[PDB]
Coordinates of C-alpha atoms and ligand atoms in Angstrom, one line a residue:
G9 CA 0.1 -0.2 -0.1
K10 CA 1.3 3.6 0.7
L11 CA 1.4 6.4 3.3
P12 CA -0.3 6.2 6.6
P13 CA -3.5 8.0 6.9
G14 CA -3.9 11.4 9.0
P15 CA -5.3 14.9 9.0
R16 CA -5.4 17.1 5.8
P17 CA -2.4 19.6 6.0
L18 CA -2.2 23.0 5.0
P19 CA 1.0 23.8 2.9
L20 CA 3.0 25.9 5.5
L21 CA 1.0 25.5 8.7
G22 CA 0.8 21.6 8.4
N23 CA -1.8 20.3 10.9
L24 CA -1.4 23.1 13.4
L25 CA -5.1 24.1 13.2
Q26 CA -6.3 20.5 14.0
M27 CA -3.9 20.6 17.0
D28 CA -5.3 20.4 20.6
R29 CA -4.3 23.6 22.1
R30 CA -2.9 22.1 25.3
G31 CA 0.0 20.3 23.5
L32 CA 1.6 17.9 21.3
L33 CA 0.7 14.8 23.1
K34 CA -3.0 15.6 23.4
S35 CA -3.1 16.6 19.9
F36 CA -1.6 13.1 18.8
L37 CA -3.9 11.1 21.3
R38 CA -7.0 12.7 19.5
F39 CA -5.7 11.8 16.0
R40 CA -5.1 8.2 17.1
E41 CA -8.9 8.0 18.2
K42 CA -9.8 8.8 14.7
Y43 CA -7.0 7.2 12.5
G44 CA -5.9 4.3 14.8
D45 CA -2.5 3.2 15.7
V46 CA -0.3 4.3 12.7
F47 CA -0.8 7.9 11.3
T48 CA 0.8 10.6 9.9
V49 CA 0.9 14.3 11.3
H50 CA 2.5 17.2 9.5
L51 CA 4.5 19.1 11.9
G52 CA 5.0 22.5 10.0
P53 CA 6.4 21.4 6.6
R54 CA 7.4 18.0 8.0
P55 CA 5.3 14.7 7.9
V56 CA 6.1 12.7 11.0
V57 CA 4.7 9.2 11.5
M58 CA 3.1 8.1 14.8
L59 CA 3.0 4.8 16.2
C60 CA 0.8 3.9 19.1
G61 CA 0.1 1.0 21.2
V62 CA 2.1 -1.9 22.6
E63 CA 1.9 -4.0 19.4
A64 CA 2.9 -1.4 16.9
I65 CA 5.9 -0.1 18.9
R66 CA 7.2 -3.4 19.4
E67 CA 6.7 -4.3 15.8
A68 CA 8.9 -1.5 14.7
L69 CA 11.6 -1.3 17.3
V70 CA 12.1 -4.9 17.8
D71 CA 11.0 -6.6 14.6
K72 CA 12.3 -3.8 12.3
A73 CA 15.1 -2.9 14.6
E74 CA 17.7 -1.6 12.1
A75 CA 15.3 0.3 9.9
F76 CA 13.9 2.1 12.9
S77 CA 17.2 2.7 14.4
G78 CA 17.7 6.3 13.2
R79 CA 17.6 9.2 15.8
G80 CA 15.3 12.1 14.6
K81 CA 16.1 15.7 15.7
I82 CA 14.6 17.5 18.6
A83 CA 14.6 21.1 17.2
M84 CA 15.3 22.8 20.4
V85 CA 18.7 21.1 21.2
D86 CA 19.7 20.1 17.5
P87 CA 21.5 23.5 16.8
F88 CA 23.7 23.0 19.8
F89 CA 24.4 19.1 19.6
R90 CA 24.2 18.8 15.7
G91 CA 24.4 14.9 15.8
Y92 CA 27.1 14.6 18.6
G93 CA 26.7 12.3 21.7
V94 CA 25.2 8.9 22.0
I95 CA 21.6 10.3 22.1
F96 CA 21.8 12.5 19.0
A97 CA 24.1 10.6 16.9
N98 CA 23.4 8.4 13.7
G99 CA 24.9 5.8 11.7
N100 CA 28.6 4.7 12.1
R101 CA 29.5 7.6 14.7
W102 CA 26.3 6.3 16.7
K103 CA 27.2 2.4 16.6
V104 CA 30.9 3.1 17.6
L105 CA 30.0 5.6 20.3
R106 CA 27.4 3.3 21.8
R107 CA 29.5 0.3 21.6
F108 CA 32.5 1.9 23.5
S109 CA 30.0 3.2 26.3
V110 CA 28.8 -0.2 26.7
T111 CA 32.3 -2.0 26.7
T112 CA 33.6 0.9 29.2
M113 CA 30.9 0.4 31.6
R114 CA 31.3 -3.4 31.8
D115 CA 34.8 -2.8 32.7
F116 CA 33.6 0.0 35.2
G117 CA 34.2 -1.1 38.7
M118 CA 36.8 -3.9 38.2
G119 CA 39.5 -1.1 38.4
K120 CA 37.1 1.3 40.5
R121 CA 34.2 1.0 42.8
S122 CA 30.8 0.0 41.0
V123 CA 28.1 2.2 40.0
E124 CA 26.0 0.7 42.8
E125 CA 28.5 1.6 45.2
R126 CA 28.5 5.2 44.1
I127 CA 24.7 5.3 44.3
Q128 CA 24.9 3.9 47.9
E129 CA 27.5 6.5 48.7
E130 CA 25.4 9.3 47.4
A131 CA 22.3 7.9 49.2
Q132 CA 24.3 7.9 52.3
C133 CA 25.0 11.6 52.0
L134 CA 21.4 12.3 51.0
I135 CA 19.9 10.7 54.3
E136 CA 22.6 12.7 56.4
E137 CA 21.3 16.1 54.8
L138 CA 17.7 15.0 55.2
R139 CA 18.5 14.4 58.7
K140 CA 20.1 17.8 59.1
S141 CA 16.9 19.5 57.8
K142 CA 15.2 18.4 61.0
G143 CA 11.7 18.1 59.7
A144 CA 11.6 21.4 58.0
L145 CA 9.3 21.7 55.0
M146 CA 11.3 21.9 51.6
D147 CA 10.8 21.6 47.9
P148 CA 13.0 18.7 47.2
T149 CA 13.6 19.5 43.4
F150 CA 17.0 20.8 44.2
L151 CA 18.2 17.7 46.0
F152 CA 16.7 15.3 43.8
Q153 CA 18.5 17.1 40.8
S154 CA 21.8 17.2 43.1
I155 CA 21.7 13.5 43.7
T156 CA 21.3 12.3 40.1
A157 CA 23.8 14.9 38.7
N158 CA 26.4 13.5 41.5
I159 CA 26.0 10.1 40.2
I160 CA 27.1 11.3 36.7
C161 CA 29.9 13.6 38.2
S162 CA 31.1 10.6 40.0
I163 CA 31.2 8.1 37.2
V164 CA 32.6 10.9 34.7
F165 CA 34.7 13.3 36.9
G166 CA 35.5 10.9 39.7
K167 CA 34.1 13.5 42.3
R168 CA 31.1 14.8 44.1
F169 CA 29.6 18.2 44.7
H170 CA 28.1 19.3 48.1
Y171 CA 24.5 19.8 48.3
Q172 CA 25.0 23.7 49.5
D173 CA 27.8 24.5 46.8
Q174 CA 26.6 27.6 45.2
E175 CA 28.6 27.2 41.9
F176 CA 27.0 23.4 41.7
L177 CA 23.4 24.9 42.3
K178 CA 23.9 27.6 39.6
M179 CA 24.8 24.8 37.1
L180 CA 21.9 22.5 38.0
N181 CA 19.7 25.6 37.6
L182 CA 20.8 25.9 34.0
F183 CA 20.0 22.4 33.2
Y184 CA 16.5 22.6 34.9
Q185 CA 15.8 25.9 33.1
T186 CA 16.8 24.3 29.8
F187 CA 14.5 21.4 30.2
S188 CA 11.4 23.5 31.1
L189 CA 12.2 25.6 28.1
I190 CA 12.4 22.6 25.8
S191 CA 8.9 21.4 27.0
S192 CA 7.2 24.7 27.3
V193 CA 4.5 26.0 24.7
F194 CA 7.4 27.8 22.8
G195 CA 9.4 24.7 22.7
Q196 CA 6.6 22.7 21.2
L197 CA 6.0 25.4 18.6
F198 CA 9.6 25.3 17.7
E199 CA 9.3 21.7 17.1
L200 CA 6.9 22.4 14.3
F201 CA 8.2 25.9 13.0
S202 CA 12.0 26.0 13.7
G203 CA 12.5 26.8 10.1
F204 CA 11.2 30.2 10.6
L205 CA 11.2 30.8 14.3
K206 CA 15.0 30.4 14.4
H207 CA 15.3 33.8 13.1
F208 CA 13.8 35.4 16.0
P209 CA 14.7 35.9 19.7
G210 CA 13.2 33.2 21.9
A211 CA 13.7 30.4 24.3
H212 CA 15.7 28.3 21.6
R213 CA 18.3 31.0 22.0
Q214 CA 18.1 30.8 25.6
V215 CA 18.5 26.9 25.5
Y216 CA 21.5 27.3 23.2
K217 CA 23.0 30.0 25.7
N218 CA 22.6 27.6 28.7
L219 CA 24.1 24.5 27.0
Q220 CA 27.1 26.7 25.7
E221 CA 27.6 27.7 29.6
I222 CA 27.4 24.1 30.8
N223 CA 29.7 22.9 27.8
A224 CA 32.1 25.6 29.2
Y225 CA 32.3 24.1 32.6
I226 CA 32.7 20.6 31.0
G227 CA 35.5 21.6 28.6
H228 CA 37.6 23.4 31.3
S229 CA 37.3 20.1 33.4
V230 CA 38.1 17.9 30.6
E231 CA 41.2 20.2 29.7
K232 CA 42.3 19.9 33.3
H233 CA 42.2 16.1 32.9
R234 CA 44.3 16.1 29.9
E235 CA 46.9 18.4 31.5
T236 CA 47.1 16.1 34.6
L237 CA 46.5 12.7 32.8
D238 CA 48.3 10.0 34.9
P239 CA 48.3 6.7 32.8
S240 CA 49.1 4.6 36.0
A241 CA 46.1 6.1 38.0
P242 CA 43.2 6.7 35.6
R243 CA 40.7 8.6 37.8
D244 CA 37.1 8.5 36.0
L245 CA 35.5 7.9 32.7
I246 CA 37.1 11.1 31.2
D247 CA 40.6 9.5 31.9
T248 CA 39.3 6.2 30.3
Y249 CA 38.2 8.1 27.1
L250 CA 41.2 10.3 26.9
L251 CA 43.8 7.2 27.3
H252 CA 41.8 5.4 24.7
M253 CA 42.0 8.4 22.4
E254 CA 45.6 8.5 23.0
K255 CA 46.2 4.8 22.1
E256 CA 43.9 5.2 19.0
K257 CA 45.0 8.5 18.2
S258 CA 47.4 7.3 15.5
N259 CA 44.8 5.8 13.2
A260 CA 41.6 7.2 12.0
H261 CA 39.0 4.3 12.3
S262 CA 36.4 4.0 14.8
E263 CA 37.8 7.3 14.9
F264 CA 37.7 9.3 18.0
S265 CA 38.0 12.4 15.7
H266 CA 34.3 11.9 14.2
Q267 CA 33.6 12.4 17.8
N268 CA 33.5 15.2 20.4
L269 CA 34.4 14.4 23.9
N270 CA 32.8 17.5 25.4
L271 CA 29.6 17.1 23.5
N272 CA 29.3 13.5 24.6
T273 CA 30.0 14.2 28.1
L274 CA 27.4 16.8 28.1
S275 CA 24.9 14.6 26.5
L276 CA 25.6 12.1 29.2
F277 CA 24.7 14.8 31.7
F278 CA 21.8 15.9 29.6
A279 CA 20.3 12.2 29.4
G280 CA 21.3 11.3 32.9
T281 CA 20.3 14.1 35.3
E282 CA 16.7 15.2 34.6
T283 CA 14.3 12.2 33.8
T284 CA 15.7 10.4 36.8
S285 CA 15.3 13.3 39.3
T286 CA 11.9 14.1 38.0
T287 CA 11.0 10.4 38.5
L288 CA 12.1 10.8 41.9
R289 CA 10.1 14.0 42.3
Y290 CA 6.9 12.5 41.0
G291 CA 7.4 9.5 43.1
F292 CA 7.3 11.3 46.5
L293 CA 4.5 13.5 45.3
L294 CA 2.6 10.3 44.6
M295 CA 3.5 9.0 48.0
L296 CA 2.1 12.0 49.7
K297 CA -1.2 11.6 47.7
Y298 CA -1.3 7.7 48.4
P299 CA 0.2 7.7 51.8
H300 CA -0.8 4.1 52.6
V301 CA 1.6 3.3 49.6
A302 CA 4.6 4.6 51.3
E303 CA 3.8 2.9 54.4
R304 CA 3.3 -0.5 52.7
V305 CA 7.0 0.1 50.9
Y306 CA 8.4 0.8 54.4
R307 CA 7.0 -2.4 55.8
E308 CA 8.9 -4.4 53.1
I309 CA 12.0 -2.6 53.9
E310 CA 11.8 -3.1 57.5
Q311 CA 11.0 -6.8 57.0
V312 CA 13.9 -7.6 54.2
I313 CA 16.5 -4.8 55.2
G314 CA 15.9 -3.7 58.6
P315 CA 17.1 -0.4 60.1
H316 CA 20.7 -0.7 60.2
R317 CA 22.3 -2.0 56.8
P318 CA 22.1 -0.1 53.5
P319 CA 19.7 -1.1 50.8
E320 CA 21.5 -3.1 48.0
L321 CA 20.5 -4.2 44.6
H322 CA 20.4 -7.7 45.8
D323 CA 17.3 -6.8 47.9
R324 CA 15.3 -6.1 44.8
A325 CA 14.4 -9.7 44.0
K326 CA 13.0 -10.0 47.6
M327 CA 10.9 -6.6 47.5
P328 CA 8.2 -7.3 44.8
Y329 CA 5.7 -4.6 46.5
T330 CA 8.6 -2.0 46.4
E331 CA 9.5 -2.9 42.8
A332 CA 5.8 -2.6 41.8
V333 CA 5.6 0.7 43.3
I334 CA 8.6 1.9 41.3
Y335 CA 7.3 0.6 37.9
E336 CA 3.9 2.0 38.9
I337 CA 5.6 5.6 39.5
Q338 CA 7.4 5.3 36.0
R339 CA 4.1 4.1 34.2
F340 CA 2.0 6.8 35.7
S341 CA 4.5 9.7 35.5
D342 CA 5.2 8.7 32.0
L343 CA 8.1 11.2 31.6
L344 CA 9.0 10.7 28.0
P345 CA 5.4 10.4 26.6
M346 CA 6.3 10.4 22.9
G347 CA 9.8 8.9 23.6
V348 CA 12.5 10.5 21.7
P349 CA 12.1 10.7 17.9
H350 CA 13.4 8.2 15.5
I351 CA 14.0 8.2 11.8
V352 CA 13.5 5.1 9.5
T353 CA 16.9 4.7 7.8
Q354 CA 15.4 3.1 4.6
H355 CA 12.1 2.5 2.9
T356 CA 10.2 0.2 5.2
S357 CA 7.0 -1.8 5.0
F358 CA 4.8 -1.3 8.0
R359 CA 1.2 -2.7 8.5
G360 CA 0.2 -2.3 4.8
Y361 CA 1.8 1.2 4.5
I362 CA 5.3 2.0 3.3
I363 CA 7.2 4.7 5.3
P364 CA 9.8 6.7 3.1
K365 CA 13.5 6.5 3.9
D366 CA 14.4 9.3 6.3
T367 CA 10.9 10.0 7.5
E368 CA 10.7 11.1 11.2
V369 CA 8.8 8.6 13.4
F370 CA 7.4 9.2 17.2
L371 CA 6.7 6.1 19.1
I372 CA 4.2 7.2 21.6
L373 CA 5.4 5.4 24.5
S374 CA 2.5 6.7 26.7
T375 CA 0.1 4.7 24.8
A376 CA 1.9 1.5 25.7
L377 CA 2.1 2.7 29.4
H378 CA -1.6 3.3 29.4
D379 CA -3.0 0.5 27.5
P380 CA -6.1 -0.5 29.1
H381 CA -5.9 -4.0 27.9
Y382 CA -2.6 -4.3 30.0
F383 CA -3.6 -1.9 32.8
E384 CA -7.0 -1.9 34.2
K385 CA -8.0 1.6 34.9
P386 CA -4.7 3.2 33.5
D387 CA -5.1 6.7 34.4
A388 CA -5.1 5.9 38.1
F389 CA -2.1 5.2 40.3
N390 CA -2.1 1.7 41.5
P391 CA 0.9 -0.6 42.3
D392 CA -1.3 -3.7 41.8
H393 CA -0.7 -3.0 38.1
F394 CA 2.4 -4.8 38.5
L395 CA 1.5 -7.6 41.2
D396 CA -0.3 -10.8 40.9
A397 CA -2.9 -12.3 43.2
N398 CA 0.0 -14.1 45.0
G399 CA 1.9 -10.6 45.5
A400 CA 4.7 -11.5 43.1
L401 CA 6.1 -9.0 40.7
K402 CA 3.9 -9.2 37.5
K403 CA 6.1 -8.0 34.7
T404 CA 4.4 -6.9 31.2
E405 CA 5.2 -6.3 27.7
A406 CA 3.4 -3.0 28.0
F407 CA 5.9 -1.5 30.3
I408 CA 8.5 0.2 28.2
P409 CA 9.5 3.4 29.7
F410 CA 13.0 3.0 28.5
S411 CA 11.7 2.3 25.0
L412 CA 13.0 -0.8 23.1
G413 CA 15.3 -2.0 20.4
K414 CA 18.5 -0.6 19.2
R415 CA 18.2 2.6 20.8
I416 CA 16.8 1.4 24.2
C417 CA 17.9 3.8 27.0
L418 CA 21.4 3.4 27.5
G419 CA 21.3 4.3 31.1
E420 CA 18.5 1.9 31.9
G421 CA 20.6 -0.2 34.4
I422 CA 21.7 3.0 36.1
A423 CA 18.4 4.7 36.2
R424 CA 16.9 1.5 37.8
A425 CA 19.7 1.4 40.4
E426 CA 19.2 5.0 41.3
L427 CA 15.3 4.8 41.6
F428 CA 15.3 1.5 43.8
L429 CA 18.4 2.7 45.9
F430 CA 17.2 6.3 46.6
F431 CA 13.7 5.4 47.1
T432 CA 14.3 2.7 49.7
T433 CA 17.3 4.4 51.4
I434 CA 15.1 7.5 52.1
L435 CA 12.3 5.4 53.1
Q436 CA 14.2 3.3 55.3
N437 CA 15.3 6.2 57.4
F438 CA 12.2 8.7 57.1
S439 CA 8.6 9.0 56.9
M440 CA 7.2 11.9 54.8
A441 CA 4.7 14.6 55.5
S442 CA 2.9 17.5 53.7
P443 CA 0.8 20.4 54.7
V444 CA -1.5 19.6 51.7
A445 CA -4.2 17.1 52.1
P446 CA -4.2 14.3 49.5
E447 CA -7.5 15.5 48.1
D448 CA -5.9 19.1 47.5
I449 CA -2.8 17.3 45.6
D450 CA -3.1 17.7 41.7
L451 CA -0.6 15.4 40.0
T452 CA -1.3 17.2 36.6
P453 CA 2.4 18.1 35.1
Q454 CA 3.1 21.7 35.1
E455 CA 4.7 21.1 31.6
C456 CA 3.9 18.3 29.1
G457 CA 6.2 18.5 26.0
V458 CA 9.2 16.3 25.2
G459 CA 9.3 15.7 28.9
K460 CA 6.8 15.8 31.6
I461 CA 7.3 17.9 34.6
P462 CA 5.5 17.4 38.1
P463 CA 4.2 20.5 39.9
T464 CA 6.1 22.1 42.7
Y465 CA 5.2 20.8 46.3
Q466 CA 6.5 21.0 49.8
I467 CA 7.5 17.9 51.8
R468 CA 9.1 17.0 55.2
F469 CA 11.0 14.1 56.1
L470 CA 10.8 12.7 59.7
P471 CA 13.2 10.3 61.1
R472 CA 12.2 7.1 62.1
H473 CA 14.5 6.7 65.0
Ligands
HEM501 C1 14.1 6.9 34.8 C2 14.9 7.6 34.1 C3 14.9 7.4 32.5 C4 14.2 7.2 31.6 C5 12.6 6.9 31.7 C6 14.8 7.2 30.2 C7 14.1 7.0 29.0 C8 14.7 6.9 27.9 C9 14.0 6.9 26.5 C10 12.5 6.8 26.4 C11 15.0 7.1 25.7 C12 14.9 7.0 24.0 C13 14.9 5.6 23.6 C14 14.6 5.6 22.0 O1 15.3 6.3 21.3 O2 13.7 4.8 21.5 C15 16.3 7.0 26.2 C16 17.4 7.2 25.7 C17 18.8 7.4 26.2 N1 19.0 7.4 27.5 FE1 17.5 7.5 29.1 N2 16.0 7.3 30.4 C18 16.3 7.6 31.7 C19 17.5 7.6 32.3 C20 18.8 7.6 31.7 C21 19.9 7.9 32.5 C22 20.0 8.0 34.0 C23 20.8 7.9 31.5 C24 22.5 8.1 31.6 C25 23.2 7.1 32.5 C26 20.4 7.7 30.2 C27 21.0 7.8 29.0 C28 20.4 7.7 27.7 C29 21.0 7.7 26.5 C30 22.6 8.0 26.4 C31 19.8 7.7 25.4 C32 20.3 7.6 23.7 C33 20.4 6.1 23.5 C34 20.6 5.8 21.9 O3 20.3 6.9 21.2 O4 21.2 4.8 21.6 N3 19.0 7.6 30.6 N4 16.0 7.1 27.5
CPZ502 CL1 15.1 16.2 24.6 C1 15.6 14.7 25.6 C2 16.1 13.7 24.9 C3 16.6 12.5 25.7 C4 16.2 12.5 27.1 C5 16.5 11.6 27.9 C6 17.2 10.4 27.6 N1 17.3 9.7 28.8 C7 16.7 10.3 29.9 N2 16.4 11.6 29.3 C8 15.7 13.5 27.6 C9 15.3 14.7 26.8

């Protein structure tokens, strides 16, 4: 057959006038009700194919894995990155970067303490800071941003920043601000009309400016690593990349020099800090709205781990309720609802249609996470979505918050380690309270574009002992 069906576009405006005024995702879900699971939407001058539903997404990403392996652009950050970094790269640059990441992290920890060990160390510092708050009300956003940023800082730069460090907090604010700009109304409009909006002042310039500033801190630190590189004591990931680059420096293959160390490092921070902290933020808000849930998670911690020894990843298999709660936080929060855009690399048959080479594809991960067949009453938060009658963890093919296939989240393991360890380490040591009654807690994101951002809230952590 040929092109997927969809709304009739105007020449310059595409389908703007058929859009839902509240955003891209709401817009696409409305087209899905009319056109089904595979459809075309013109974003400005650009046709993009949407795949929705568990079956259609798996079919593309696993069954047609290589054709769907291309990375599409995200208009708001592409001017900065320009296809550097594992996230944004394509073809050989991408394959080679991603394989090196994978092999590097398999070797990580034989030489130096493991990623789990670094996450436990950070969780330790967190709970001492929460203790130090002495039950004061706080917006936990900055702390949650700090802990996830510190895990990447520890892997990449071999150091941690203190929670009160002003230069650290300044940098974190620049990221946070960058992510809310990307997902703002303007950021979604840039997604459609970057071709002419780029000529004007606006949030896209502020984003470029923020990224330039961040990449300057990174570059300076990378330069200090080169200047002080000691081959017999490599300190961190940056030292590992440097030493490799020096050894492979002579020959231009799997060439480092079609790479950019600074941009790759920045993209690690970009992917690594925000979704995890936003997941944490959403998860504690959810625990405030459904307090019996946090209470049941504590009972399992008390039973399997106790009050004295630190949570460990080995504990996960013995804590089905807590795993179900974290899966439900991710499923409900739906933090990258349209995932990250793909492109089909060659003309591709798909469910009777033919998708042209180089067409952008959005896989609407949200529609898998909310599929009613898999999740009875999918718009409500309920950990029983991931539990069988016997209370064991019930895994499902619908649960794809990290996506699938060739491009599946590179930090899936790390992200899962952080969520489990931060969640359980905080809850081992503290109960939580807020001044706002559950009925007055609204869980509606304050922004929903590329990323979902939870509303602001206050919380206090009360020591158990
Ligand atoms: C709970 C937190 C996280 C969620 C929900 C998440 C989800 C995702 C999703 C949906 C994608 C797009 C996959 C695709 O293109 O189909 C992605 C990509 C990616 N993620 Fe994450 N992610 C999380 C945390 C992390 C962390 C902590 C890191 C860094 C260690 C990371 C690194 C990356 C990278 C490098 C990519 C690009 C992969 C590629 O293009 O080959 N992510 N993630
Ligand atoms: Cl624009 C954009 C792209 C990728 C991510 C991401 C990947 N993994 C975690 N976050 C976030 C935002």
